[PDB]
Each structure stands twice: as structure tokens, then as C-alpha cells.
Amino acid sequence: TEMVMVDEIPFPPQITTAKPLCLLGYGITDIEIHFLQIKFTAIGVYLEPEIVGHLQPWKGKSGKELAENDDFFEALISAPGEKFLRIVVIKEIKGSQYGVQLESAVRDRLAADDKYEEEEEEALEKVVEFFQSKYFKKDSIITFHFPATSFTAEIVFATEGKEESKITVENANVVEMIKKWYLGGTRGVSPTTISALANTLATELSK
Amino acid sequence: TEMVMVDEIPFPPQITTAKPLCLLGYGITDIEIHFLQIKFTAIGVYLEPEIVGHLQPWKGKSGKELAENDDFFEALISAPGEKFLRIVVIKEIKGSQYGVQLESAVRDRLAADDKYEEEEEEALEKVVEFFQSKYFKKDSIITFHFPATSFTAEIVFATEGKEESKITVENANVVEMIKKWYLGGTRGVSPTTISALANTLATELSK
């Protein structure tokens, strides 16, 4: 089966964790400023096809109204089942620059919920340390696997030449805010990914 | 004599037009966002040493107070004498992306002064057309020469391989707003260049 080209970067149409997962959304992170676009990463979102059954309260809704519906994305983020994010570096950067973008996104959300406590701080520190020790060359790959059987996340960094590097995040709140960074509707870091997911899910939910 | 390294790009310490001109300020254009710096261009500002005599109303002022003094930079922009800007591309871009940044900076200033009239529009169109036909490879060089003897500007684009390409801007108002884009104090496109000029001129004005 053919790779899906996401802004000229190949993505598998299916990934298997504990279950077969389908590519149901993809997009990029970028900035458009001074009449210029600069692309940072490409993203693929992999979900169980059965997620359409968990999202039946939104059947008949269009992609445009699902794209602006933060309750919908809240349900998707918390739906039961396996989930997997695949991120491919476009602009080379220091690992610690992604670390701090992540840390700031997670800390901000924890603080807003008053959940920035000892365990969250310790878990987030371990994630920051993990990225601090990496260099994100172009086509490097970060993956976030969210298993259905625990409120944890396994983070893998892969780059040609080196062996895969891995950590497991054990704090549920930190794991939730990582999911929200990428998947929280109008607050997601990648509006293109949100629109693709929302359009793909609206179509599946109409059937 | 040694080249002056401006963020790893060489700049002559002196350029000769109608008169010998000294490098009195240099800096970069950049964006700092998402905990990351992206550098667009390096700038050198070349002025007659005699400009210190035209700026005597600001003698005894420090670099920090000259850096926040828009009357000072207004006097520098309009002072008599030869002036030369040298811009070296760091991030490769389309010519039309610099064209539109320029056009938007000039048009905005003309509009604020209600000077966006037929002649200005025609002159600015010719500048936009000039850049539209170029590709700004890294280390390409844009120079703006402002002669003391007319209210005009000669723009030169140079890149290795190709011959120099040149146009002459004949509209005084457009030429003034180009100078202000780069040199207008707290409104300049390059705060680093402003600070360097202001510190260099403060020191010379103290002698």
C-alpha cells in the first residue's frame, strides 16, 4: 500500500500498536509572517476506526462545525482506545527548543486547570530532559503512543544513524495535556491537522 | 584592511560612492518566536564621517537615549550627504517576498502621511516589479545608494553567477520611506541596527 505524502513527507496509511490504527488526520506546524511561510513539522494522527463509534453524538455534523467544536475534540481526546501521533521534523532545531515548546504548552494547560503539582512537575522535567539531549535533524521522527490500557504515553525519537531513544510518561495529567497540545480543536498547535481530522471524522460520522 | 563580520557575513568597513563612507551600524532582521530565532538578512549602514557634524544637536547623549529618540533618526535620515545600505540575504526567499515587505512598509508610511499619490504609486510599482523578477539566494546582496546630489536611490541586486541588476528610484517620497524602513529609530525593521548606529553615533558625538 502507498505512503501518504504529507507536504512531501511520507506517512504510513496504517500503523499497528495493540490494534490497527488508521491515519485520520495530517497537517503541519508553521508560521506565516512578513508574507512568508516557514514550516516546522508534519503531523499524522492515527486512531482506531472504532473511534467513529465513540463519537456518535456528533453524527450528521459537517467538517466545518466539528472543526470549531471543542466539545467534539475533548471527546476525541478522551475517547477509549489506542492513539498514536507521528511528527516529522521539517526545520532542523535543537531538541531543547521542542522540549520548551512542549513544556510551555503542557505547563500552561496544567496551570489553567490548577493541576501543576509535584508529580506533574517531575514528569514534565523528565520529558524536557529527554528532548534536551537530542538534535532534531530534518526527517527526524517523534512519535507519541497513547495506549488504551493505561493513562500513559511512550515517546520515541528516531533519526537515521542512531538507535531509537524512548521514554514513558506515567503522569496522566501530563499525558492529557500533550494530547491537547496537538488535538484540542481551536487551541491545537496545528489548525491544518484539526481541519483534516474534523473533515475526515465528519465524513465517517455521516455514514 | 579587514572585513567586518556581521553575524558571520563579511562587510567592508568602508565603501566609496561619491565620497568615502564608513560602516557606522550593522545588525540583522529576524524573528524570535516559539523559543527559536530565524535570521532573514544582515544589514550594514554606511555614512559619511561628516554626518557627526550634522548631528551636533545630539552631542553628549548616550547610545540608549539616542536609540529611543525618533527626532535623532529623523535628522539622520534627512541629513545632507551620501548614504548607502548593504543588505545580505541569510534566509533564501523569493524576490517578490522582499518586494511585498518593502512595498507594504513604504505604502504604509506614505498613507500615514497622505502621500500615496500617482507618482509614488508608479515608482513603487517599478520597485516591486524589479524584485518580483529576482530569486534571493543566500549571500545575495541588495544595496541602496542615496546620493547627496538628488532625492533618488539606486537599487542594485547582485548574486554570484549573474550580472548586477540595477534600477533608479526617482520619487523622493518613496526614497524617503525606504530610508525610514531601515533607519527610523523605534520603527526601524532592524532594532539591532538601530542600537548599533545609536551607540556608534553617541560615542562619536561625545568627542
Numbering used by the authors:
A (entry chain A), B (entry chain A): 41 to 247
Any passages from the paper?
Chalcone isomerase–like (CHIL) protein is a noncatalytic protein that enhances flavonoid content in green plants by serving as a metabolite binder and a rectifier of chalcone synthase (CHS). Rectification of CHS catalysis occurs through direct protein–protein interactions between CHIL and CHS, which alter CHS kinetics and product profiles, favoring naringenin chalcone (NC) production. The chalcone isomerase–like (CHIL) protein family is noncatalytic, yet it shares a “CHI fold” with CHI. The protein X-ray crystal structures of PpCHIL-A and VvCHIL reveal CHI-type α/β folds with high structural homology to each other.
When the structures of VvCHIL and MtCHI-I bound with naringenin are aligned, a significant amount of the VvCHIL pocket is occluded. Most notably, tryptophan 221 (W221) and glutamine 141 (Q141) produce overlaps with naringenin. Nearby to the tryptophan in the structure of VvCHIL, a glutamine (Q141) also occupies the canonical binding site, yet this glutamine is not highly conserved across CHIL sequences. On the other hand, the presence of the tryptophan and glutamine side chains create a fundamentally different chemical topography for the VvCHIL-binding pocket, potentially changing the nature of ligand interactions. Supporting this idea, analysis of the VvCHIL-binding pocket reveals a pocket volume of 20.8 A3, whereas the volume of the PpCHIL-A–binding pocket is significantly larger, calculated to be 50.7 A3. The comparison of VvCHIL and PpCHIL-A protein crystal structures suggests that W221 may be responsible for the destabilizing effect to VvCHIL caused by naringenin binding. With the W221L substitution in place, VvCHIL does not undergo thermal destabilization in the presence of naringenin. Similarly, a variant of VvCHIL with the Q141A substitution does not undergo thermal destabilization in the presence of naringenin, suggesting W221 and Q141 together are required to facilitate destabilization. For VvCHIL, naringenin binding produces the opposite effect on the thermal shift relative to PpCHIL-A and MsCHI-II, resulting in reduced protein Tms at high naringenin concentrations. The VvCHIL peaks calculate to 26 kDa (major peak) and 68 kDa (minor peak), indicating that a minor amount of VvCHIL is stable as a multimer, perhaps as a trimer in this experiment.
